[PDB]
Amino acid sequence: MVGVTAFGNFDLASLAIYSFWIFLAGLIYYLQTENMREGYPLENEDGTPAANQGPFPLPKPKTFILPHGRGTLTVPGPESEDRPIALARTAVSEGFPHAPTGDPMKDGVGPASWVARRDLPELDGHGHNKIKPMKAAAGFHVSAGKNPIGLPVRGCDLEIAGKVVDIWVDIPEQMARFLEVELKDGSTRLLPMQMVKVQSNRVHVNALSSDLFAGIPTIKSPTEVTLLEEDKICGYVAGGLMYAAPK
Amino acid sequence: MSKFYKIWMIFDPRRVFVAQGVFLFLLAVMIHLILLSTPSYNWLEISAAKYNRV
Amino acid sequence: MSKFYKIWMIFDPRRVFVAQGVFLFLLAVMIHLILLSTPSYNWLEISAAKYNRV
Amino acid sequence: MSKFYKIWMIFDPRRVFVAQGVFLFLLAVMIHLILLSTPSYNWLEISAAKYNRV
Amino acid sequence: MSKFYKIWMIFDPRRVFVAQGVFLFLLAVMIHLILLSTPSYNWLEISAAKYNRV
Amino acid sequence: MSKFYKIWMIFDPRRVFVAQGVFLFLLAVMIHLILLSTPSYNWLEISAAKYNRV
Amino acid sequence: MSKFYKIWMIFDPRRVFVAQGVFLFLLAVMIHLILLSTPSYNWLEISAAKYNRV
Amino acid sequence: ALLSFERKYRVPGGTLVGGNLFDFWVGPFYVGFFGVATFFFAALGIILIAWSAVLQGTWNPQLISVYPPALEYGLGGAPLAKGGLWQIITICATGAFVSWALREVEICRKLGIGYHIPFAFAFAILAYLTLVLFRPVMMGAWGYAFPYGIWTHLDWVSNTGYTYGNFHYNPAHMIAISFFFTNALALALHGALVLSAANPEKGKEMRTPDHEDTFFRDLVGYSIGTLGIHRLGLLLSLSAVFFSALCMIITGTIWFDQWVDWWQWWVKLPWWANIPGGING
Amino acid sequence: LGYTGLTDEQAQELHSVYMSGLWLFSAVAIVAHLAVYIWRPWF
Amino acid sequence: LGYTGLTDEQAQELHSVYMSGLWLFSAVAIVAHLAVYIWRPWF
Amino acid sequence: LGYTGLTDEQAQELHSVYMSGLWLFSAVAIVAHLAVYIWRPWF
Amino acid sequence: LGYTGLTDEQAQELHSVYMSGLWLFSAVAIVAHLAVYIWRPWF
Amino acid sequence: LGYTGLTDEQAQELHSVYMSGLWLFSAVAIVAHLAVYIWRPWF
Amino acid sequence: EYQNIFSQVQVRGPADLGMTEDVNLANRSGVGPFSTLLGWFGNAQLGPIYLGSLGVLSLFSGLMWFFTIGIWFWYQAGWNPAVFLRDLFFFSLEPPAPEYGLSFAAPLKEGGLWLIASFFMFVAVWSWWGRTYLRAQALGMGKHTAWAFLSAIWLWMVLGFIRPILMGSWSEAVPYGIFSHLDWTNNFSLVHGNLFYNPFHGLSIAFLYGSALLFAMHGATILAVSRFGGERELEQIADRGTAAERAALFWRWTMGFNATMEGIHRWAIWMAVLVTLTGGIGILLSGTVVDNWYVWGQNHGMAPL
Ligand SMILES: CCCCCCCCCCCCCCCCCC(=O)OC[C@H](COP(=O)([O-])OCC(O)COP(=O)([O-])OC[C@@H](COC(=O)CCCCCCCCCCCCCCCCC)OC(=O)CCCCCCCCCCCCCCCCC)OC(=O)CCCCCCCCCCCCCCCCC
Ligand code: BCL
Ligand SMILES: COC(C)(C)C/C=C/C(C)=C/C=C/C(C)=C/C=C/C(C)=C/C=C/C=C(C)/C=C/C=C(\C)CC/C=C(/C)CCC=C(C)C
Ligand SMILES: COC(C)(C)C/C=C/C(C)=C/C=C/C(C)=C/C=C/C(C)=C/C=C/C=C(C)/C=C/C=C(\C)CC/C=C(\C)CCC=C(C)C
Ligand SMILES: COC(C)(C)C/C=C/C(C)=C/C=C/C(C)=C/C=C/C(C)=C/C=C/C=C(C)/C=C/C=C(\C)CC/C=C(\C)CCC=C(C)C
Ligand SMILES: COC(C)(C)C/C=C/C(C)=C/C=C/C(C)=C/C=C/C(C)=C/C=C\C=C(C)\C=C\C=C(/C)CC/C=C(\C)CCC=C(C)C
Ligand SMILES: COC(C)(C)C\C=C/C(C)=C/C=C/C(C)=C/C=C/C(C)=C/C=C/C=C(C)/C=C/C=C(\C)CC/C=C(\C)CCC=C(C)C
Ligand SMILES: [Fe+2]
């Protein structure tokens, strides 16, 4: 087949390369269409549908069957924010930021945003809660690191905010997820473990100042935390980085 | 021999039918490619030789 | 001997049948490839030489 | 022979039969390939030599 | 000697038997390969030379 | 002396037995390979030379 | 001896015995390999020279 | 314009240079100070590439090439049509890359996420700077860099590799290739596993991370986890790029001969140097 | 016995049908080898 | 034993069937080796 | 003591069967070595 | 004390059988070395 | 002290048996060195 | 300051035996030891591993392949452990010489033992592919891993089985050595002109660099949003949280377009199977259709001519 061309310089290599270009165009189209299953249709900044929607048409719906009788999820589907957003326009023209009306960490906007996830705890493959306090978890213990229980907690303002009392553990993955921190008023808050640095004699939280620890959203049941509570806590703690820069 | 029908008792017909379609087509294509590769049994070339098409 | 029927109380016929089919096809293909590879027993070129087609 | 039947009180016959099948097939293929690899005992080449195939 | 049977109260016979089978087969194959690689004791070449197979 | 048996209250017998068997086999193989690689004590070669096998 | 028995108040016997066994074996192997590497004291080659094995 | 959830995240803050100035979007893109800088540098580089194509006399995009100055210029300026355009485009490309990284930092701190992505990008920028700046500067000329062409920078790769014989005898090269291959394998396995859990057999419920853990524990006897697999992917990619940069930086600066000859230090170790057998004996 | 759940009668019937298939395949193969050996023997 | 759950009678019958199969396979192997050795001895 | 769950009697019988198999294997190996040594001694 | 866990009377019997095995193995080794030294001494 | 859990008598007895083992190993090494030095001295 | 690269506290509980969807639990083993180093980076638990019939087949054949290559290396070393360690990476099993073609008559020292090892390796790899398919099926999952592995197998088959048959010689195949197969790739590029000018070589390199790029991007993104529990992606698919939203908005504000928590994995799997698939095509084309890739590039507008 060496040198055997159908026409011009077109041989099996040229046939293969053009076939691959057509396949690659089709595959990119498929991949983008599959990407388009969340956040669409596009909106105007006043909430209405946008005149311009994009070159790629919206894919056909597909359905997930959630485990443990949690239901089904059809995407793309009718998605609403379902929460009030305390933001104000700074310009009539589009493309400009929206300014917080009040306290952005309290209101949950910007880097302090949270999503209205399900108000149920996340489950493992057996139906039990995925995340449990280490006292509830039977047979769990701290293995090979600096044990944080009892260490003082220090905010970004060089002041003590409380002490670590428990560790919340992801039972299936066998990893630590949250630090339970008791404040001065005898109330416990949860801090994401990705947001604290465990030092030799303290736990440092750079995102949050000592006073702001009081405003962390709490959990309604001491023995478990739901997905909505995880979003609220993590959004608050992460937004502390931008909205607690002074002090 | 008169009772081979019970094979469909144990095999899903749809998987079997798809599998044998793929198998038969691949086998036919392979045999045709083998025949074309050999200088003999390349029917186009031997017809060209037979009809003096240079 | 004459008790060999009891293997089916040990092995699931579906798995055995699929494995047997793939094994038989692969063995046949392997033996045909062995024969085609040798200059003798390549029936295509044997026929080509015998009928003076080259 | 004497009391070896008690092996089946220790081992699951399914695993034993599968291991035997795999081992026996692989060993037979290896020995056949070794025989084909020797210039003697390659039945194809020596049949070709003794019948003047090539 | 007389008291060795108590090895089986320490080791699982199934695991021991599987490891022992693998060990024995690999050892035997290695020794046969070592003999084959040796100009002498290559029984195939020895028989080829004795009977003038080449 | 006369109280070395207490080592078995320090070490788990099965772990020690596995390690000991692996160690002994590896040592023996290493020594056999060392003796094969030496032109002396290569028993196959010296047997071939004594009996005129080449 | 005098007061050394108290080292075992400090070090766990399993760790010490395992490390000691590994250390002693590796030391012995290293000394043996050093002796083999010198043309003198290489007991395999000097015996070959003494008995004219080559 | 916006995603269904985008509105609450567009807030006025997180810039590095400037304030409300440049704190706006153009369509989907965020355009800060470094957005303006990135756009300027990228447009300048692209127009200069087109003008170099005009100068060279070809319009075939696969034949367009922008060559570095010849070795006779050393580390100084060159005429525009004889290496100056390459230098200007290199400055523009460096500026575009660094401004892109800084823009990503601004987006990271507007969204409250960590700066892993700009760090990972900086690794690639350092590999590019190794090939285009550090190695030519140590070697003494801009002509040891590679040209800006689709098929001629491959000529640079070929010539540079074959100067030192067969190039995959360079050890750091071996490490970099191993990391690249392992990374592609890990990416395929990871994507396949996540998809298979999210897309089970028809009519089944979605699988859980326990099913993924069980799948790889059944297959290979070990599962690294979700956090573990993402850490592994990041580190595999970065280690591949780091070791490629190393193998190139030591290539014309410390080593000068065939690399297959470098591998002789292991063979010539004193205790087996002269044993008569095998390949090297 | 309990490995598959096939009755003894069921196993006998399945084995009978399977052996019919095996004999058919082997007879075709034997005829094939006879024809090839007559055409061009390998011994 | 408790390792596999077969009783003594089940094991004995299983071994009888297994040994019949083994002796058939070995008989075929011996016949093949005898044929090859008459055709081309390796000693 | 019985880490495997086998008692003294089970172990004794297991060892008896394993000894019988080992001695059979060793007898076959000894005969093979005797034949090879007669055919081609290595000493 | 027994860290792995064995009574002193279990340890004594395990060591007695282990010594039996060690002495058998080493006696076979002595005989092998004696044969090799007679055949081809290395001193 | 409480690092390992061995009391005074246990540590003393363990050291006694350990020293027995050390002296046996040393005596074997001493005999080996004497044999090697008689055969081929290094001083 | 914590970058979530290494765990700072490590917790252990009872080992997880796994799911029981329809897996034959008798074919599993026990849990292995826990490892603290792996715990620092990922999961500490080892095992349990499934080993069924296809596992026995794969283990036997792969063990025989490894053993055959190793025994050949020992033969080349002269049965000398020192030479074996010294000239390791220099030993090789070579395929038959070009005179033998595809025939199975090459001697054991020349190319027969290479054929034996290749048969063992073929069986091992195909049985391992079957094992991946069956392990996905037992748990009820999709077979994405099986088809990605099939792409990799396609490149392996082209290199070792398909192209030698089209070229009509086993000598075209790859040797079993460390430096030897590297020399094989160099000589392959030299004999066929310049493999840089193979366009499917270029696509394969594009997709390899793309795998590195994409999976640095994706690992960095998941690590960046893991403060919101982003690494638990299977539930971010079912319940979109702030982590997935922030990731999508980062990439949309950066490069104009984004993905989902599932579409990014589709991108990933395709970006890797494409490197191996295009590589297989490009290797199959070399020598059978194009004997000189630089001249092909000159004729196809890629080289100045
Ligand atoms: C005109 C020329 C141009 C041609 C094309 C132009 C046409 C226009 C453009 C068309 C492009 C469309 C691209 C979109 C595809 C995306 C689909 C997708 O991902 O999801 C849907 C679907 C499943 O979606 P899902 O939602 O995840 O399902 C979940 C299920 O519930 C549960 O899961 P499941 O059990 O159902 O299976 C899950 C899996 C399932 O999808 C599959 O089943 C794939 C089947 C394997 C691939 C087929 C090749 C195998 C050989 C044939 C023997 C088996 C055939 C029967 C397969 C069994 C199917 C029942 O889905 C995946 O996502 C796997 C992704 C990775 C697949 C990689 C396969 C590479 C194999 C390498 C083969 C190499 C040998 C030959 C190489 C080429 C020869 C030169 O997956 C597919 O359909 C995969 C399509 C496979 C494409 C094969 C590749 C073509 C290669 C051609 C290269 C270009 C030629 C240039 C060279 C020419 C030389 C002369
Ligand atoms: C002088 C050398 C030549 C050259 C010669 C070749 C040749 C020849 C080939 C490549 C191939 C490739 N080259 Mg090139 N290459 C050159 C220069 C480059 C440069 C560069 C910057 O210069 C780059 C980046 C590349 C990059 C690439 C890759 C994209 C591609 C290999 C994919 C892969 O993963 O293979 C590795 C993966 C596999 C082989 C798949 C393995 C799958 C099987 C199933 C694994 C079995 C494992 C076994 C069971 C293991 C047991 C393991 C134990 C269990 C642990 N080449 C120059 C021009 N290159 C290949 C290709 O496809 O080209 C089109 C190829 O064959
Ligand atoms: C390099 O090596 C060389 C090539 C030189 C030689 C190496 C060679 C080897 C090692 C060759 C191996 C040859 C072997 C071992 C062949 C085995 C052949 C067999 C065992 C064939 C059996 C074929 C049986 C077949 C097709 C069965 C057909 C049965 C049927 C259609 C009917 C089954 C239907 C059943 C319906 C189920 C219904 C019953 C119920 C109760 C529902
Ligand atoms: C390079 O070095 C070279 C190769 C040159 C030389 C180096 C050589 C070495 C190091 C050789 C080592 C040789 C060794 C160490 C050999 C050991 C061989 C053995 C240990 C063989 C065992 C044979 C035992 C056999 C087959 C088992 C017979 C067992 C049986 C049938 C099993 C029956 C047991 C039963 C069934 C269960 C009873 C059940 C109840 C309920 C009572
Ligand atoms: C390069 O260096 C060269 C090669 C030149 C030389 C360098 C050499 C070295 C460093 C050589 C090392 C030589 C050594 C140190 C060898 C080790 C020799 C030993 C100490 C071997 C142990 C032999 C003990 C053996 C086989 C044990 C047999 C034991 C048994 C069957 C034990 C039975 C245990 C039982 C049955 C269960 C009973 C249970 C109850 C409850 C009663
Ligand atoms: C002391 O150490 C011992 C001896 C115990 C073991 C140590 C061992 C060593 C040192 C093992 C060496 C392993 C190495 C160095 C392996 C090299 C593996 C490589 C690197 C292979 C590289 C490319 C190989 C490629 C593409 C193979 C493709 C192979 C194929 C598709 C298989 C083709 C199957 C077919 C050809 C032949 C068809 C014939 C029949 C009968 C089906
Ligand atoms: C050329 O020179 C080079 C460069 C190679 C190096 C030159 C020199 C060096 C640096 C040589 C190193 C020489 C050394 C430092 C050797 C160390 C030798 C030792 C420390 C040997 C200890 C031997 C002790 C032995 C075998 C004891 C084993 C003890 C036992 C059986 C007794 C244990 C039994 C017990 C414990 C039960 C315990 C009781 C209860 C109630 C649990
Ligand atoms: Fe992911």
Tab-separated table of C-alpha atoms and ligand atoms in Angstrom, chain C residues 30, chain D residues 33, chain N residues 65-66 69-70 73-74 84 88 104 114-115 118-119 121-122 156 159-161 170 174-178 181, ligand 6:
chain	number	residue	atom	x	y	z
C	30	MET	CA	-3.978	-19.741	16.087
D	33	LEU	CA	6.150	-24.295	20.829
N	65	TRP	CA	6.083	-14.458	31.050
N	66	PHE	CA	8.136	-12.759	33.774
N	69	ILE	CA	12.297	-13.368	30.506
N	70	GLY	CA	14.147	-13.634	33.818
N	73	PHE	CA	18.460	-12.954	31.477
N	74	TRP	CA	20.098	-15.419	33.870
N	84	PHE	CA	23.147	-10.362	36.423
N	88	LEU	CA	20.633	-5.797	34.099
N	104	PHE	CA	7.357	-20.546	14.129
N	114	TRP	CA	10.551	-14.787	22.572
N	115	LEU	CA	7.490	-16.394	20.977
N	118	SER	CA	4.843	-13.452	23.939
N	119	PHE	CA	2.139	-16.124	24.090
N	121	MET	CA	2.014	-12.204	27.873
N	122	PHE	CA	-0.866	-12.184	25.368
N	156	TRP	CA	-0.038	-2.921	22.677
N	159	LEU	CA	3.054	-2.858	18.495
N	160	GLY	CA	3.474	-6.556	19.170
N	161	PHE	CA	1.024	-8.562	17.087
N	170	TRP	CA	8.247	-11.217	13.750
N	174	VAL	CA	9.563	-5.206	20.312
N	175	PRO	CA	12.301	-6.907	22.367
N	176	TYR	CA	11.880	-7.673	26.066
N	177	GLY	CA	14.589	-5.513	27.605
N	178	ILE	CA	15.004	-2.184	29.352
N	181	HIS	CA	13.076	-1.576	23.643
O	6	LIG	C1	15.761	-13.311	39.953
O	6	LIG	O1	14.822	-12.722	39.065
O	6	LIG	C2	13.899	-13.649	38.522
O	6	LIG	C3	14.634	-14.567	37.531
O	6	LIG	C4	13.288	-14.507	39.656
O	6	LIG	C5	12.805	-12.859	37.724
O	6	LIG	C6	13.433	-11.480	37.385
O	6	LIG	C7	13.187	-11.064	36.123
O	6	LIG	C8	13.253	-10.053	34.921
O	6	LIG	C9	14.691	-9.507	35.158
O	6	LIG	C10	12.275	-9.804	34.028
O	6	LIG	C11	12.461	-8.771	32.867
O	6	LIG	C12	11.208	-8.284	32.674
O	6	LIG	C13	11.357	-7.262	31.467
O	6	LIG	C14	12.769	-6.607	31.675
O	6	LIG	C15	10.329	-7.098	30.554
O	6	LIG	C16	10.296	-6.102	29.333
O	6	LIG	C17	8.961	-6.005	29.180
O	6	LIG	C18	8.764	-4.992	27.935
O	6	LIG	C19	9.556	-3.778	28.507
O	6	LIG	C20	8.026	-5.132	26.815
O	6	LIG	C21	8.087	-3.808	25.939
O	6	LIG	C22	7.376	-3.684	24.778
O	6	LIG	C23	6.692	-5.101	24.678
O	6	LIG	C24	5.662	-4.964	23.806
O	6	LIG	C25	4.651	-4.354	22.795
O	6	LIG	C26	4.965	-6.444	23.660
O	6	LIG	C27	3.893	-6.540	22.811
O	6	LIG	C28	3.620	-8.085	22.989
O	6	LIG	C29	2.430	-8.361	22.356
O	6	LIG	C30	1.048	-8.370	21.666
O	6	LIG	C31	2.205	-9.939	22.560
O	6	LIG	C32	2.138	-10.662	21.127
O	6	LIG	C33	1.728	-12.185	21.306
O	6	LIG	C34	2.223	-13.143	20.430
O	6	LIG	C35	3.234	-12.379	19.579
O	6	LIG	C36	2.901	-14.348	19.589
O	6	LIG	C37	1.774	-15.248	18.929
O	6	LIG	C38	2.053	-16.759	19.192
O	6	LIG	C39	1.101	-17.517	19.776
O	6	LIG	C40	1.348	-19.016	20.046
O	6	LIG	C41	-0.243	-16.869	20.181
